[PDB]
Paper text:
Here we report the identification of a direct interaction between the BCL6 POZ domain and members of the ansamycin antibiotic family: rifamycin SV and rifabutin. By plotting the chemical shift change (δΔ) of the most shifted peak, as a function of rifabutin concentration it was possible to estimate the Kd of the interaction as being in the order of ∼1 mM. To explore further the atomic details of the interaction we crystallized the BCL6-POZ domain in complex with rifabutin. Despite the BCL6-POZ domain being a symmetrical dimer only one molecule of rifabutin is present per dimer. The rifabutin is located at the dimer interface and binds to the surface that overlaps the surface bound by the SMRT and NCoR peptides. The napthoquinone ring of rifabutin occupies the pocket, which is occupied by the residues histidine1426 of SMRT, histidine1352 of NCoR, or tryptophan509 of BCOR, in the three POZ domain co-repressor structures. The most important interaction appears to be a π-stacking interaction with the aromatic ring of tyrosine58 of the BCL6-POZ domain. The aliphatic “handle” or macrocycle of rifabutin makes electrostatic interactions with asparagine21 and arginine24. Specifically apolar interactions with tyrosine58 and electrostatic interactions with asparagine21 and arginine24 are involved in the binding of all three molecules. The binding of rifabutin to the BCL6 POZ domain also appears very similar to that of the small molecule, 79–6.
Residue numbers in the entry:
A (entry chain A): 6 to 127
B (entry chain B): 7 to 128
The structure:
């Protein structure tokens, strides 16, 4: 009896999820940041973000197809964090470092916060 | 941005598996013989060519129940489902032929290749 672990499977799935997202397949939510719209899978959001996890665990909010993020959240930093959720890659530049950390703190992605803090420190 | 955080994909899959066991946002029942397996369509689709084709056909895309072909055995399907959500494929001499046959059906060819090696080791 063997329990075989496939070590790039998790990477393969997340990659596929991203492919479904870029074709807009089975995306079941629109996140509204200021007034820009991002389509996403609820399940991915919850799997990465303490905020979205909190929200969608509420059996009431669970079938909401629209979510209005707080208005201090800028769309640029959100889009970067959405890309990270889906790619495990974080586009960090001096120009965006601050908007990314604030958005991450807000989404409760604390490992993203702490790599932003590590970045800050050239 | 050159750096990827490979464990992230693993966190993501770990949390999707959590949602599944809590039955949060599961949106399909897969029916295998007379056995029901709750799941998320996105995850099935990201893991199986067959599921990708089913959930991408508009006549099938919007049903909460999907029946697999009658020949498919429930023990085999349960192992593949666990694999999709954990990356671990649990093979036993008691389950192997049905896992192979079920993985072939689901067009999961790397899992098929690993079953053949186990039978050769057995
Ligand atoms: C890593 O990704 C692979 C599958 C993952 O696994 C699955 C389970 O998750 C998927 C995800 C998340 C997807 O988004 C698609 C598919 C699958 C899976 O199957 C597809 N699967 C088929 C569905 C069933 N058969 C086809 C047959 C029955 C007609 C197999 C593929 N088509 C598929 C699609 N779209 C298309 O075909 C279209 C509109 C265009 C394709 C253009 C080129 C030709 C490709 O892009 C090529 C350069 C390469 O990228 C793919 C061929 C790649 O294959 C690999 C590993 O080289 C898959 C996308 C998809 O968008």
């Amino acid at each position: 009896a063997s329990q075989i672990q496939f070590t790039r499977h998790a990477s393969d799935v997340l990659l596929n999820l991203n492919r479904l997202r870029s074709r807009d397949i089975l995306t079941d939510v629109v996140i509204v940041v200021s007034r820009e719209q991002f389509r996403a899978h609820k399940t991915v959001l919850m799997a990465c973000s303490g905020l979205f996890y909190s929200i969608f665990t509420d059996q009431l909010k669970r079938n909401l197809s629209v979510i209005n993020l707080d208005p201090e959240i800028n769309p640029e930093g959100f889009n970067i964090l959405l890309d990270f959720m889906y790619t495990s890659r974080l586009n960090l530049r001096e120009g965006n470092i601050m908007a990314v950390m604030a958005t991450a703190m807000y989404l409760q992605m604390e490992h993203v916060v702490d790599t932003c803090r590590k970045f800050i420190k050239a």
